Design a protein around this ligand. Structure first.
Ligand code: SUF
Ligand code: SUF
Ligand code: MG
Ligand code: MG
Ligand code: MG
Ligand code: MG
Ligand code: MG
Ligand code: MG
Lengths: 336, 336
């Protein structure tokens, strides 16, 4: 499946860089490269989650070719939305690696121009939309689903950065209420609701009750998944995560810090207060220790299981009347 | 007129920050501030150009209150589009002052998070759109006019930055063909076509021939205007331009450099080659001299007049059947 999708990336790049009024050749050529370097290289859970959902929501006699092309085109839009959020996300959290290569902003000859780059990735979404789903009765729903998805992410990011101000001892604010809302807006909405929703809309399920149903599940799915990102960020093989964890040194509000702050002793609350948020490798190495000294990685395993079950309970109560293997499939793609 | 518009800014900020699921209070509060600090402080040519065009394109018996509220709401969207392009534009060209105050990214406690800030400004546009022009038969035209306006700007910016790579002697590429297309995409499209167009669409003129007509004019208007920005950037009272010119040190492709490169002697082509693009105040002070030694500021005056006339010729040939004082009004707001 993954391989058929990636095969189509070529068709989308050719639709996007065809433009060359040849007065923008250079700009187009530039664009092409930003797409290759930033859309490609990932897992493709999002882009894939849509095309697999369509098939399972649209009758075989309606899964025509055109309806297919529109299927993964919308697939790649979710990709570009990610490509966009990422490219800008790296500059902000100040990253070095993404998808096992150096961040685009870090590439010699990019730096802060990446900002316009991330912008161009956004414009490509809605450019595809107009180019395939235009004559369709869901076109305005797609668009309004992307715009409100971004704004939710963008809000969640605001929360994040707001909760982790550079050089500011901020353990006070690392509560769970916050972490949940933060992840709900910057991750759960666009990485789980968005793909499914696009599917439904494309299949004719423009319902409100339906959509709130999928949302109920998909959102809870999305919280776990970020929780996963938090862990992987610290305790995960860089060669498999294709990126380094900057959460500590970035004074982020992680599940981890929320976790450690929860079961951290008075004496242990400082080692913490003192080492979190600094860029000092040993100050940071000190943090990671306190985690390991708190048995956290096992505390993680627990949740990973208790969460799984609850999601499953959830799927077993709200999926109706959608093919349960629309959510079941997601929770095989991430809950591993 | 200007004062009635600015009065309404309060109503828009209150629509945007009302939101406080109070789980995003901080994010909203943050948002409010990014709007105050970045939407306010300008001339308001764009926001104003729409509300003044509506009145002149919609019959008095149709200019009801609601249709008015929708009028300047769309007015402020063009503002936010600017607020967005600006906030990100400053970080990229590395500015210090905008609207006679320090750039948002420069404010202590912002820096690169401004990127998410600029993003939030965008999301506010389409959030207003959905909030006022939703039930209207032009809603999808507005949206598609903004998205394709941004993408045009974003392309033009790509051109700019592409044509002025940091620390790279780039006089070769400062041709006029380039400068025209560059300005056509990063300035003319969204600062002149966009406001008028939004007006027409709102008034019922969804025509293609009509829209190409206004575009013919408005675009040529927009080229002059950037040309104006180029000059003001160098030869303009900072206390009236509320910002400093970084064009030389940013190795930009200005009308000026295009102008000086045109009538620069062999011997004079270097002083140029040597001093343009450097951050050295005296290297830059050297450039400004060569301009003054080339009589350029008078060469500017000429064009400002020959351009004016041509635009006027243009208005006197394409405005029909729109109130000519829809373009005439613009060319009193800028051609001064
Ligand atoms: C996925 S997006 C919201 C960015 C992240 O969530 P961050 O917020 O921790 O930088 P990451 O998982 O990509 O690291
Ligand atoms: C208006 S927008 C495209 C940015 C500028 O045009 P720049 O391209 O010279 O930075 P400026 O006039 O705002 O300086
Ligand atoms: Mg982040
Ligand atoms: Mg990151
Ligand atoms: Mg992470
Ligand atoms: Mg610029
Ligand atoms: Mg600038
Ligand atoms: Mg300028």
């Amino acid at each position: 499946e993954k391989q058929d999708f990636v095969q189509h990336f070529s068709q989308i790049v050719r639709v996007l860089t065809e433009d060359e009024h040849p007065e923008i050749g250079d700009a187009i050529a530039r664009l092409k490269e930003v797409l290759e370097y930033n859309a490609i290289g990932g897992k493709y859970n999002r882009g894939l989650t849509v095309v697999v959902a369509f098939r399972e929501l649209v009758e075989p006699r309606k899964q025509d070719a055109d309806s297919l092309q529109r299927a993964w085109t919308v697939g790649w839009c979710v990709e570009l939305l990610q490509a966009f959020f990422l490219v800008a996300d790296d500059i902000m959290d100040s990253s070095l690696t993404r998808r096992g290569q150096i961040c685009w902003y870090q590439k010699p000859g990019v730096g802060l121009d990446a900002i316009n780059d991330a912008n161009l990735l956004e414009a490509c979404i809605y450019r595809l939309l107009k180019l395939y789903c235009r004559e369709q009765p869901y076109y305005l729903n797609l668009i309004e689903l992307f715009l409100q998805s971004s704004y939710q992410t963008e809000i969640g990011q605001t929360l994040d950065l707001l909760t982790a101000p550079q050089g500011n001892v901020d353990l006070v604010r690392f509560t769970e209420k916050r972490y949940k809302s933060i992840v709900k807006y910057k991750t759960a909405f666009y990485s789980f609701y968005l793909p499914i929703a696009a599917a439904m809309y494309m299949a004719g399920i423009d319902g409100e009750k339906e959509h709130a149903n999928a949302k109920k599940i998909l959102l809870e799915m999305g919280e776990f998944f970020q929780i996963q990102d938090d862990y992987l960020d610290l305790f995960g093989d860089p060669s498999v995560t294709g990126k380094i964890g900057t959460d500590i040194q970035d004074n982020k509000c992680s599940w981890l810090v929320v976790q450690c702050l929860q079961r951290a002793t008075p004496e242990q609350y400082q080692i913490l207060k003192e080492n979190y948020g600094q860029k000092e490798a040993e100050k940071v190495a000190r943090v990671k220790a306190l985690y390991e000294e708190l048995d956290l990685p096992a505390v993680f395993l627990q949740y990973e299981e208790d969460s799984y079950s609850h999601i499953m309970a959830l799927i077993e109560q709200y999926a109706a009347p959608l093919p349960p293997a629309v959510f079941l499939g997601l929770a095989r793609k991430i809950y591993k």
